[PDB]
Structure formats: structure tokens, C-alpha cells
Symmetry: D2
């Protein structure tokens, strides 16, 4: 029974940190919903928020069951009208999408790091599942960026 | 003469990507200046922007001298009044600071990655210098977060 | 039909090169191994990397990229012929491989996240899943053999 | 006076453990090495890790954290006594160490970025600088010896 073994310090710190990262990203993405015009991007931000909330439910149960204090999360946000945001304070759709895409890429790496350092099998499996879901979400972001013409092409190999 | 040798594909992609990352962060941080109340945080955001612009000058010269196309950067931003930002669109000081601190930590890692994969000595040395500066800036961010009471304490070891 | 980007080429060429190096190293480790449960897992790792390499070599060759050098043939050796100071012991070998697998998970995720060509992202997502399963087998071996060094433990 | 956080303890204990493993492995590599310029650099790496380890063991001991096991004594061996299939050759050894150094740079940066205690950040910033210099020596060796495999090159 994996959950009758203690977590190690790395497992505790990494999962606590991941949960805190999610809390911060939920808050930022809730702000991005208010800054976004594009409805396709908005839908994906909403999906990301929900996905992180699902991850959080599992993480919080893990930490609560193992006597680890939870990190404080920023609160939910009011709605705002897009046209009321001063231009200099406004995040635009391509840059919102870029940010989220980079966040997803970083999250893939963090999942792999946690799996690699895990000794409790349940922790490894949780992050394996998170990684599988995040690969799919990342693929949706790439499709969006392609469809919208937001992707900046890097230097290309000539065959 | 290092600069008479061709860059390898990794050096090109990594430096191009780093420059693009800087361009995006400059744009986001210019928006954060408009969202910030705290003058100490504002000063550090301004310092970060200037530091990235200095890095960019070197990166752009490297790429321009080696026949690599530069990534397009978002433009500069107008000033905005803090009180005109709808609450639901507003980024608050602790969360701005957290974001920048995470960005700095990620940048340290990216610098080390580039140094490690470098074969041209000038590329390794450039990133070594960037890393040294970024360590100092990161230490200033930590001091800020401590001073302001913005740092969330992680689980602590009991000796 | 879309070209690979510089990062896709560099990352895939480097991952292939890494596998080639690890196949050579692990072939040597097989000659240093006493424990046959460990040996069987090294064999599995080698075959898996060889399987990945067929896919990567095809991708690179089909896109006009020169391949890194293949692993050389390596003969068997008798464990007992290895001088003591030159011998890697079973827990040392296991720790090395375990660390290599953990690193490789991270590399796969890095490649996925920087890929624009969907076929590259797909390939490395499949490699990642395989490495998750393999790392899981290594962990079970290390626990079963008593080779794992416990890190600092949280107390609930 | 401030306690270490869980990440500081886990990261420092793990970095120490890693150094201990690499000291053992590199001692073995010395016995496999023909080239004396390579051997001298392995000796330098070992001594450097030992120097880091004195600092880390003190930090951990002073904060009530149990230390990981120290490297065991490892005798010398004659290169010519190593069966061919068990022998790591000079370029293989060099590639391994070069990769270890690159990984170690990244680990140092990771520890710096997650540190809250200034003394931990300072320590790893100093280790990082040392590894930058050492990796630079490894690269020069690999170039001088003709061991570097060129990756795909950009054309200006």
C-alpha cells in the first residue's frame, strides 16, 4: 500500500510547489479571460483553468492526507469589460496564447521531474496522468496558434 | 577565433528562442509597470526590462552576424492609470512579483542549458555572463519578496 | 511536408546520439553485472533505445540530416576478469541507469514542448510513456534488491 | 538562524548523493583511462566534488539532516587487465563526464532559484561558476583530442 509509506522531502516540496504554481496560473488565466477577445482562445483558457482545478483536487487530497500545509491561493476574480481595460495594461490575444503555451511546456517538464524523483508509486502515477493530459492540451494550443496565425516560425532546416 | 566557426543548430535555436523569450517578457513587464502600485517593485521591473534589453543587444548582434533571422518583438506600450484598470483585469503586486521571480529562476536554468550545449566559446561566455547578472537580480527579487511580506513559506525542515 | 525546425533537428539528433552512447555504455555494464534481474533490465533498455533509434534515424535521414555514429560492436567479458578497481557494482550500475531514465523523461518533455511538427511531438510522447513504464521497473528493482538509499522523509 | 525548507534539504542532500556517486564512478574511470590529459581532468573533478561535499556535509549535519553514504575506497587497476568488452574508452569517458558537468550546471541553477536561505543560494552560485570553468576545460580537451562529434551546423 503506497499510501502507508511516508512521502520524502522532495515529493512534499515538489507537489506543494506544483499546487502553488497551479494556484497562481489559475489566477493569471482568470485575468486573461477578461483580457481576451478571441472566443477560441477563451475556451481553451477556461479548459486550462478547469484542468488545473482537477489536478488541484488530487494534490490537495494528497497533501491533506499527509499532514502538509497547503499553499494559499489567490481568489476568484470579477468579470471586466474588454473595452474598459486601458491599452497599456491590456494583454493581447497572441501574447496570452504564447504565455499559456510556454506554461504548458514548462508543466510537461515539471511533471517529468516529479515522476523521476518519486519513490511512492502513487505520486509517480498521478504525475504520469497529469503529463498525458497536458500533452493533449499542449497539442490543442499548438493547433490554435497555427490556425490563428499567432505562431512565430523559428529557423527552419532546409532538406 | 570563435566567431570564424559556424554556430550549430542548437546554438541558433537556443539563442533565437532566448531572444524571443526576452521580447515577450519585456512586453509583459511593460504591462506590469502599468498594473503595479508599489514603487520598489516598479523599480525592479524597470531594471529587469533594461537588463533584458542589454542581453538583447548582444543576442541580436550575434544573430545578425551569423545570418539568422530575428524574432519579431511586441512594441512598447502606452502609460495607463492604475485606477482605470478594471479590478478583474488587474494584476496585483504580490502576484506580479511571484511571476517575475519564477521567470528569473527559469532564466537561470535556460542560461545553464545553453552554456552546456555550446561549442562556440563566445556563446558559452555570453550566457555565463548573463547567468551571473541574473543570479544577482534574483537575489534582489527574493529580498523584495521578504521585505514586502509577499513570500509564501514552503514546508520547513525542523532541526 | 513542413520542414523540421532547427530545434527539432538538433534535439532529435542529440537524443539519437545520447541513445547511441548509452547503448555502448550499457553493453559494457552488462559485462560488469552480477545480478541477472538487473542484467535483464539493461537488455530491455538497450533494445528499447534501439527501437527508438530506428525511428529517429529514419526521420533524420528522410529530412537530409547526417546521422551521428552508430554504437560499435562490443564483445562479452567475464565479470571475474575485471580488476576490482575497474568494476562497477550492481547498485552503482542501477543508480546510473535510474538517473539516465529520469533525465530522459525530462528530455522527452522538452522535445514535445518545443515541437511544431506534430509527428515529432507524437514520437516523443510515445517515447515518454515507454520511459515512464521502464523507470517504474527500475524503481521496483531498486526496492526489491535493497539498493535504494532513502532520502529525508516527511513525518505525517 | 532561519530553517532550511524541504526543497533546500532535499536538493542539497541529493546533490551531495550525486557527487558521492560520481566520485566513485570517476575513480573507476581513472582506472579505465589511457590518456593522461583526460585522467588529470578526472582527478580535478573528483577533488572539486570533494571540496563541495565538505561544505554540503557541514550544512546538512549542522541542520540535523542525516548524510548519504560516503564513497567507498576504490583501489587502482591496470588498464591492460580490463577485458575489452568491460572497458570504457577515452572518448566515451570524456562524453560521460561532459554530460555530467552540463547536467550539474542545470542542477546548480535549479537550486539557486528555489533557495530562500541566502547561504544556500550563495553556495550554489559559487559551485555553478566552478562548473562553468570546468566544463570549459572539458570542451577544450574534447576539441584538442578530436573527440567531439560535430552536430548539424548552421550555414551563415
Amino acid at each position: 500500500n503506497p499510501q502507508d509509506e511516508p512521502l520524502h522531502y522532495g515529493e512534499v516540496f515538489s507537489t506543494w510547489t506544483y499546487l502553488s504554481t497551479n494556484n497562481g496560473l489559475i489566477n493569471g488565466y482568470r485575468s486573461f479571460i477578461n483580457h481576451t477577445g478571441d472566443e477560441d482562445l477563451k475556451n481553451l483558457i477556461d479548459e486550462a483553468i478547469q484542468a488545473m482545478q482537477d489536478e488541484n483536487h488530487q494534490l490537495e487530497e494528497l497533501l491533506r492526507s499527509n499532514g502538509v500545509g497547503l499553499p494559499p491561493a489567490p481568489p476568484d476574480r470579477p468579470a471586466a469589460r474588454l473595452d474598459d481595460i486601458p491599452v497599456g495594461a491590456r494583454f493581447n490575444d497572441p501574447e496570452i496564447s504564447a504565455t499559456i503555451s510556454m506554461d504548458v511546456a514548462k508543466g510537461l517538464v515539471t511533471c517529468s521531474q516529479i515522476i523521476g524523483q518519486s519513490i511512492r508509486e502513487d505520486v509517480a502515477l498521478m504525475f504520469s496522468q497529469f503529463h498525458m493530459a497536458k500533452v493533449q492540451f499542449g497539442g490543442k494550443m499548438l493547433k490554435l496558434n497555427k490556425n490563428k496565425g499567432w505562431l512565430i516560425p523559428p529557423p527552419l532546416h532546409s532538406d
